[PDB]
């Protein structure tokens, strides 16, 4: 039973515990139970995998999970999403640097505590529901079935502090007819290290992250699948999830709407980053593999392709993709004897109304 604890600006205090047993009872199958807790998320799963579905090396694995998400604690317009479901996925190895995934999933979503807002209600209207705009004490449940696929490319020279090679992850999903929702969702992550000097102490890192999803036949993608940008892992110098559309709230009685700086996310995202890794200035004793220093330029955007700017002239056009946030700063990573250490200082030099600045960001971790 292995644990882990962490503390950072993006998710607060993280707790992790799990255990893995292979060849369970001499049957070939592997079993595991894993759980994670955030300031905004509690997650737990149970998996049973067969690495010999075919002699060719194809694996057939199952998953049973529950997830509780409290959007207010992630700094989004308030709502609660308690979900659970199952997943069956095949994994195909292609070569040393490539692998594929194909699977089917079921997921139930229980939504509650939705503070009425325009974009969120636009999705609900597309689902035939007509909840009041004056009551946060509401409820909406869905049951979906999905096809899931993924591709992983990885040819790095080493896992920790890579100096050369690229990493690419592609994931996609789409609902199967008969589900409640009708939509698709795709994401692309890339990272490319290029060494400048012969000794690989000066390195250029280029990272990209893309996401796009949309509904089918009148329906929209559910707001609880939105993408988010801003924070330590996307655009440093911005508070986690602040980048993109902000909530437009309905009035409360027990066309007059309220502006806000509460992020909500969007169904389209584009994030890029250029990082210049250098040797640490006074720590170059020739055994400096424990620290990595870099300067970076981050940028990203998140928009709502279904925002109807004409009906909401008094409020920004949240469908425009061109409001590109940008930042620049410094970062230090350290494999210290107390655990992994990462911190950065960044300044946003391109902001938009409502965006929340967070110049200093860090993450601390311990594994036992």
């Amino acid at each position: 039973f292995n644990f882990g604890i962490g503390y950072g600006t993006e998710s607060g205090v993280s707790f992790q515990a799990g255990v893995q047993q292979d060849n369970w009872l001499g049957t070939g199958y592997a079993v595991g139970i894993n759980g994670t807790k955030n300031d905004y998320q509690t997650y737990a799963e149970l998996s049973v995998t067969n690495p010999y579905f075919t002699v060719d090396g194809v694996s057939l694995g199952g998953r049973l999970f529950y997830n509780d998400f409290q959007a207010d604690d992630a700094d989004l317009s308030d709502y609660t999403n308690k979900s659970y479901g199952t997943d069956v996925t095949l994994g195909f190895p292609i070569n040393e640097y490539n692998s594929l995934r194909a699977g089917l999933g079921y997921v139930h979503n229980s939504l509650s505590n939705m503070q009425p807002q325009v974009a969120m209600w636009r999705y609900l209207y597309s689902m035939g529901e007509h909840p009041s705009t004056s009551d946060q004490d509401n409820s909406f449940k869905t049951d979906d079935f999905t096809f899931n696929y993924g591709w992983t490319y990885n040819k790095l020279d080493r896992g920790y502090f890579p100096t050369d090679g690229s990493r690419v992850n592609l994931t996609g999903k789409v609902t199967i007819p008969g589900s409640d929702n009708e939509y698709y969702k795709v994401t692309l992550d890339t990272a490319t290290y290029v060494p400048i000097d012969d000794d690989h102490k000066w390195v250029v890192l280029g990272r990209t992250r893309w996401g796009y999803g949309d509904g089918l036949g009148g329906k929209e993608m559910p707001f609880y699948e939105n993408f988010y940008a801003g924070g330590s892992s996307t655009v440093r110098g911005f508070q986690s999830n602040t980048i993109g559309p902000k909530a437009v709230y309905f009035p409360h009685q027990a066309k007059d709407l309220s502006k806000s700086d509460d992020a909500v996310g969007g169904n389209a995202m584009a994030v890029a980053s250029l990082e210049f890794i250098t040797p640490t200035p006074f720590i170059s004793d020739k055994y400096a593999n424990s620290v990595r220093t870099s300067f970076f330029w981050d940028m990203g955007t998140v928009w709502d392709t279904n925002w109807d700017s004409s009906q909401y002239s008094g409020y920004p056009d949240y469908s425009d993709p061109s409001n590109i946030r940008m930042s620049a700063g410094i970062a230090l990573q350290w494999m210290s004897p107390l655990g992994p250490l990462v911190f950065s200082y960044a300044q946003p030099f391109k902001k938009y109304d409502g965006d929340k600045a967070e110049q200093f960001q860090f993450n601390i971790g311990k594994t036992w």
Partner: nanobody, 126 residues
């Protein structure tokens, strides 16, 4: 000092129908986290209802239609201190006004807030 987060309401009292009152609320002790803060109220016969909220950044302000246009919620320059300026009051504003705090985004439901104050009485005479 206190053994937990404490919210202390100040202001309030007796005012004429068309008068004004300024309430305040402050998180006692030392809190290193920024809180969204809100005002609720419970009338003599009715149940506890929402009045106004303001985000931690103060960028989001929200009122119930009853008091919209008459009340004004604002964050003080100090840590986690909010005020509620109530103008053109009315006998239907009489109630115990409670202060509520919350880390993360604001909300209208009382169960979403993590800390509450003891409340202050507000009385409006016809």
């Amino acid at each position: 000092g206190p053994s937990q987060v404490q919210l202390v309401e100040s202001g309030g009292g007796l005012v004429q129908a068309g008068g004004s009152l300024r309430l305040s609320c402050a998180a006692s002790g030392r809190t290193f986290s920024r809180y969204a803060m809100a005002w609720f109220r419970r009338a003599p016969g009715k149940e506890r209802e929402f009045v106004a909220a303001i985000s931690a950044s103060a960028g989001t302000i929200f009122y119930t239609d009853s008091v919209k246009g008459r009340f004004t919620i604002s964050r003080d320059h100090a840590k986690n201190t909010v005020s509620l300026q109530m103008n053109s009051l009315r006998p239907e504003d009489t109630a115990v006004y409670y202060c509520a705090a919350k880390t993360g985004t604001w909300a209208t439901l009382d169960r979403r807030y993590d800390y509450w104050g003891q409340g202050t009485r507000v009385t409006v005479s016809a």
